[PDB]
Design a protein around this motif. Structure first.
Motif, mmCIF file in Angstrom:
data_model
loop_
_atom_site.group_PDB
_atom_site.id
_atom_site.type_symbol
_atom_site.label_atom_id
_atom_site.label_comp_id
_atom_site.label_asym_id
_atom_site.label_seq_id
_atom_site.Cartn_x
_atom_site.Cartn_y
_atom_site.Cartn_z
ATOM 1 N N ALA A 37 0.825 -1.187 0.000
ATOM 2 C CA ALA A 37 0.000 0.000 0.000
ATOM 3 C C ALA A 37 0.880 1.267 0.000
ATOM 4 N N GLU A 38 1.949 1.234 0.769
ATOM 5 C CA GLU A 38 2.856 2.383 0.894
ATOM 6 C C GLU A 38 3.625 2.667 -0.392
ATOM 7 N N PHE A 39 4.141 1.621 -1.039
ATOM 8 C CA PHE A 39 4.745 1.765 -2.364
ATOM 9 C C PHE A 39 3.721 2.344 -3.367
ATOM 10 N N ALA A 40 2.494 1.818 -3.359
ATOM 11 C CA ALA A 40 1.406 2.323 -4.208
ATOM 12 C C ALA A 40 1.143 3.804 -3.985
ATOM 13 N N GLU A 41 1.133 4.204 -2.724
ATOM 14 C CA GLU A 41 1.005 5.634 -2.362
ATOM 15 C C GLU A 41 2.125 6.532 -2.941
ATOM 16 N N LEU A 42 3.381 6.072 -2.852
ATOM 17 C CA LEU A 42 4.492 6.791 -3.503
ATOM 18 C C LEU A 42 4.315 6.861 -5.019
ATOM 19 N N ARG A 43 4.042 5.725 -5.674
ATOM 20 C CA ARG A 43 3.870 5.769 -7.118
ATOM 21 C C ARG A 43 2.815 6.810 -7.528
ATOM 22 N N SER A 44 1.769 6.978 -6.718
ATOM 23 C CA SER A 44 0.685 7.938 -7.013
ATOM 24 C C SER A 44 1.034 9.395 -6.665
ATOM 25 N N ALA A 45 1.498 9.604 -5.435
ATOM 26 C CA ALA A 45 1.661 10.946 -4.871
ATOM 27 C C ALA A 45 3.095 11.489 -4.927
ATOM 28 N N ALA A 46 4.107 10.617 -4.983
ATOM 29 C CA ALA A 46 5.516 11.077 -4.921
ATOM 30 C C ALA A 46 6.406 9.953 -5.383
ATOM 31 N N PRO A 47 6.417 9.670 -6.703
ATOM 32 C CA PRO A 47 7.141 8.505 -7.254
ATOM 33 C C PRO A 47 8.665 8.475 -7.064
ATOM 34 N N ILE A 48 9.253 9.652 -6.829
ATOM 35 C CA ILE A 48 10.622 9.774 -6.311
ATOM 36 C C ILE A 48 10.498 10.622 -5.037
ATOM 37 N N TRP A 49 10.852 10.041 -3.906
ATOM 38 C CA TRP A 49 10.573 10.657 -2.618
ATOM 39 C C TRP A 49 11.769 10.476 -1.718
ATOM 40 N N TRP A 50 12.159 11.579 -1.070
ATOM 41 C CA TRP A 50 13.261 11.539 -0.141
ATOM 42 C C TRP A 50 12.784 10.827 1.131
ATOM 43 N N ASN A 51 13.406 9.684 1.366
ATOM 44 C CA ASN A 51 13.170 8.844 2.546
ATOM 45 C C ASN A 51 14.229 9.189 3.587
ATOM 46 N N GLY A 52 13.904 10.162 4.418
ATOM 47 C CA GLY A 52 14.757 10.532 5.547
ATOM 48 C C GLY A 52 15.022 9.394 6.504
ATOM 49 N N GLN A 53 16.244 9.353 7.012
ATOM 50 C CA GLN A 53 16.617 8.447 8.100
ATOM 51 C C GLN A 53 17.324 9.176 9.215
ATOM 52 N N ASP A 54 16.848 8.985 10.443
ATOM 53 C CA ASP A 54 17.482 9.622 11.588
ATOM 54 C C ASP A 54 18.796 8.944 11.915
ATOM 55 N N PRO A 55 19.659 9.655 12.663
ATOM 56 C CA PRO A 55 20.926 9.104 13.098
ATOM 57 C C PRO A 55 20.770 7.788 13.865
ATOM 58 N N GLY A 56 21.606 6.811 13.502
ATOM 59 C CA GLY A 56 21.548 5.457 14.070
ATOM 60 C C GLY A 56 20.458 4.537 13.552
ATOM 61 N N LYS A 57 19.650 5.029 12.600
ATOM 62 C CA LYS A 57 18.512 4.318 12.049
ATOM 63 C C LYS A 57 18.601 4.100 10.514
ATOM 64 N N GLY A 58 19.782 4.303 9.938
ATOM 65 C CA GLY A 58 19.991 4.266 8.488
ATOM 66 C C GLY A 58 20.562 2.973 7.953
ATOM 67 N N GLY A 59 20.513 1.895 8.749
ATOM 68 C CA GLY A 59 20.949 0.576 8.286
ATOM 69 C C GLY A 59 22.406 0.494 7.908
ATOM 70 N N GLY A 60 23.233 1.315 8.571
ATOM 71 C CA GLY A 60 24.680 1.367 8.348
ATOM 72 C C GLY A 60 25.165 2.544 7.525
ATOM 73 N N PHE A 61 24.217 3.346 7.064
ATOM 74 C CA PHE A 61 24.456 4.535 6.257
ATOM 75 C C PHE A 61 24.098 5.700 7.158
ATOM 76 N N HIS A 62 24.899 6.762 7.050
ATOM 77 C CA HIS A 62 24.861 7.877 7.966
ATOM 78 C C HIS A 62 24.773 9.215 7.195
ATOM 79 N N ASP A 63 24.122 9.174 6.041
ATOM 80 C CA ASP A 63 24.032 10.301 5.159
ATOM 81 C C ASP A 63 22.666 10.994 5.238
ATOM 82 N N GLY A 64 21.790 10.511 6.112
ATOM 83 C CA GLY A 64 20.515 11.157 6.331
ATOM 84 C C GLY A 64 19.345 10.611 5.546
ATOM 85 N N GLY A 65 19.580 9.633 4.668
ATOM 86 C CA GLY A 65 18.505 9.081 3.858
ATOM 87 C C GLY A 65 18.884 8.794 2.410
ATOM 88 N N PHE A 66 17.857 8.557 1.591
ATOM 89 C CA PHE A 66 18.009 8.128 0.219
ATOM 90 C C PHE A 66 16.778 8.513 -0.552
#
Ligand code: HEM
Ligand SMILES: C[C@]12CCC(=O)C=C1CC[C@@H]1[C@@H]2CC[C@]2(C)C(=O)CC[C@@H]12
Length: 398
Positions: free
Chosen positions: A22-51
Motif C-alpha cells: 500500500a505504501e509503495f502504491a502511495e508513492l507511485r501515485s503521490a511522490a514517485p521519487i521521494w526523499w526517505n529521511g533516516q534519523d541518526p543510528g537508524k539508516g541501516g549502516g548509512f549515515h548520510d541522512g537518507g536516500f
C-alpha cells in the motif's frame, strides 16, 4: 504522500511482518521519487541522512542503464545492514563484482561470463532435472512439512554446486556456508556470522582453484581470475544465487495456493511465461541501491552528487502504468518487462537463465509429484530490509 511520520522503506521491522505494498502504491501515485529521511543510528549502516526512494519501473531502468552516473561501488548496492555495522564491513564488500564499477567490473564480468554461457548452464539441465524430481518425490513421501526446507532450499544450492563442479562429498559444507552468507537481522539467525562463513568459503574456494568451469575461470586466455578473485566469485554466488532463487520458489508456490486457477493452468501446460511471472511476483530482491557520481535530473527530481537512490524492484514490478492488472498473478503474463533480475545494464543478473531453469524444473516436479498441495499455516517472513525472504512455510503435500 500519506505515510506515517518517520516511515522507512528499508526498515527490517516492516519486512519481518509484511511487504509494504500500500505504501509503495502511495508513492507511485503521490511522490514517485521521494526523499526517505533516516534519523541518526537508524539508516541501516548509512549515515548520510537518507536516500531517494525510486518506485517507478522506468526510473529504475534509467538508473540501471546509467551506471556511468549511478555507482555500485561508492556505497555498495545492499541498502540495509544492521544499524551498528562498521563502515569497513560495508567497504570490504567492494571485492565482489556486484559492488564494482567500470573498468574493474568490466574485466571481471567478461571473465566470469565463461561460467554463464548457455552451454555452461545448459549442461546442468539433466542433473538438475533429476534432482528436482527426487526432491519433489521425497516431499510427497513425507506427506507434510516445511516447503522451504523440503522443496525450495536444495535445487538452487545444487545449481551452484553443479556449475562449480563441487565434489559430492564437499556439498554439505558448501551449502552450510552458503546458507549463512547473506546478512540479516532475524532473531532465528542471531548466532550466524557471515564473516566466519565467508572466510571459510574463500579458503575452500582458493584450495579448489589451487588443485585445478573452475578451470576456465582460472586458466589464462592472459585474463583469468586470481585465486582470491575466484574465492570472491564463489562468495558472490552464495549471496546472489541461493536465497534469491529459493524465495522465488516459495513465493511462487504461495501465489499458486492463493490463485488456484493459475495452478490448474500451470499443471496442464507448464507455460514458458510462468518463470518470469514467478520472479515478478516473488521479487526476491526487494531493493538495491546506487550512489550518484554527479548531479542528475531524474523525472524532474534533482538528484545530487553523493546521494543514494534505492531502486525498489518490489514497487517497480507492480507499476500500474506498465503492467495490466499488476496485482493479478498471471502465469501467461505478456508482455512482462519486470526488473526482478534488475534493470538492463552492466550489472543485470548474470544468473537469470540459470534461475529460470531452476524454477521451471522444480515447478514441473512439484506439478508432477504434488499436484494437490495445500498450506497448513502462514509463511514466516525473514527480518531483512532488502531480501524478501520466507524462512518456513508448513504445507500438506498430499
Ligand atoms: C530468482 C533468482 C534471482 C534473482 C531475483 C536475482 C536478482 C538479481 C539482481 C536484482 C541483480 C542485480 C542487477 C542490477 O543491479 O542491475 C543480480 C545480480 C547478480 N546475480 Fe542474480 N538473481 C537471481 C538468481 C541468480 C543465480 C541463480 C545466480 C548464479 C548462480 C545469480 C548470480 C548473479 C551475479 C553473479 C550478479 C552480479 C552481476 C554483476 O554485478 O555484474 N543470480 N541478481
Ligand atoms: C558475505 C558478505 C557479508 C554479508 C552479505 O550480505 C554480503 C556479502 C558479500 C561480500 C562479502 C561479505 C563478507 C566479507 C567479504 C567476504 C569480503 O571480505 C570480500 C567480499 C565480502
Amino acid at each position: 504522500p500519506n505515510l506515517p511520520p518517520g516511515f522507512d522503506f528499508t526498515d527490517p521491522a516492516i519486512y519481518a511482518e509484511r511487504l509494504p505494498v500500500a505504501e509503495f502504491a502511495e508513492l507511485r501515485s503521490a511522490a514517485p521519487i521521494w526523499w526517505n529521511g533516516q534519523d541518526p543510528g537508524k539508516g541501516g549502516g548509512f549515515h548520510d541522512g537518507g536516500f531517494w526512494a525510486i518506485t517507478k519501473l522506468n526510473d529504475v531502468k534509467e538508473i540501471s542503464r546509467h551506471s556511468d552516473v549511478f555507482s555500485s561501488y561508492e556505497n555498495g548496492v545492499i541498502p540495509r545492514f544492521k544499524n551498528d555495522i562498521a563502515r569497513e564491513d560495508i567497504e570490504v564488500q567492494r571485492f565482489v563484482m556486484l559492488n564494482m564499477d567500470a573498468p574493474h567490473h568490466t574485466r571481471l564480468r567478461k571473465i566470469i561470463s565463461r561460467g554463464f554461457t548457455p552451454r555452461a548452464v545448459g549442461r546442468l539441465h539433466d542433473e538438475l532435472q533429476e534432482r528436482a524430481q527426487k526432491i519433489a518425490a521425497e516431499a510427497a513421501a513425507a506427506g507434510s512439512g516445511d516447503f522451504v526446507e523440503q522443496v525450495s532450499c536444495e535445487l538452487p544450492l545444487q545449481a551452484i554446486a553443479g556449475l562449480l563442479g563441487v565434489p559430492q562429498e564437499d556439498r554439505g559444507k558448501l551449502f552450510h556456508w552458503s546458507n549463512e552468507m547473506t546478512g540479516n537481522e532475524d532473531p532465528e539467525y542471531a548466532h550466524i556470522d557471515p564473516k566466519a562463513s565467508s572466510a571459510e568459503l574463500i579458503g575452500y574456494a582458493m584450495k579448489m582453484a589451487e588443485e585445478k568451469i573452475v578451470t576456465q575461470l582460472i586458466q589464462a586466455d592472459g585474463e583469468k581470475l586470481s585465486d582470491d578473485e575466484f574465492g570472491f566469485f564463489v562468495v558472490m554466488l552464495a549471496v546472489a544465487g541461493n536465497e534469491t532463487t529459493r524465495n522465488s520458489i516459495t513465493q511462487g508456490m504461495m501465489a499458486f495456493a492463493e490463485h488456484p486457477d493459475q495452478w490448474e493452468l500451470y499443471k496442464k501446460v507448464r507455460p514458458e511465461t510462468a518463470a518470469d511471472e514467478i520472479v515478478r511476483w516473488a521479487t526476491p530482491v526487494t531493493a538495491f541501491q546506487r550512489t550518484a557520481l554527479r548531479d542528475y535530473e531524474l523525472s524532474g527530481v534533482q538528484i545530487k552528487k553523493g546521494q543514494r537512490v534505492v531502486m525498489f524492484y518490489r514497487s517497480a514490478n507492480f507499476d500500474e502504468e506498465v503492467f495490466q492488472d499488476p496485482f493479478t498473478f498471471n502465469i501467461l503474463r505478456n508482455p512482462n518487462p519486470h526488473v526482478g533480475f534488475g534493470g538492463t545494464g552492466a550489472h543485470y543478473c548474470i544468473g537469470a537463465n540459470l534461475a529460470r531453469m531452476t524454477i521451471n524444473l522444480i515447478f514441473n516436479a512439484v506439478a508432477d509429484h504434488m499436484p494437490d498441495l495445500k498450506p497448513i499455516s502462514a509463511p514466516e517472513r525473514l527480518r531483512s530490509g532488502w531480501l524478501n525472504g520466507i524462512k518456513h512455510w508448513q504445507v500438506d503435500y498430499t
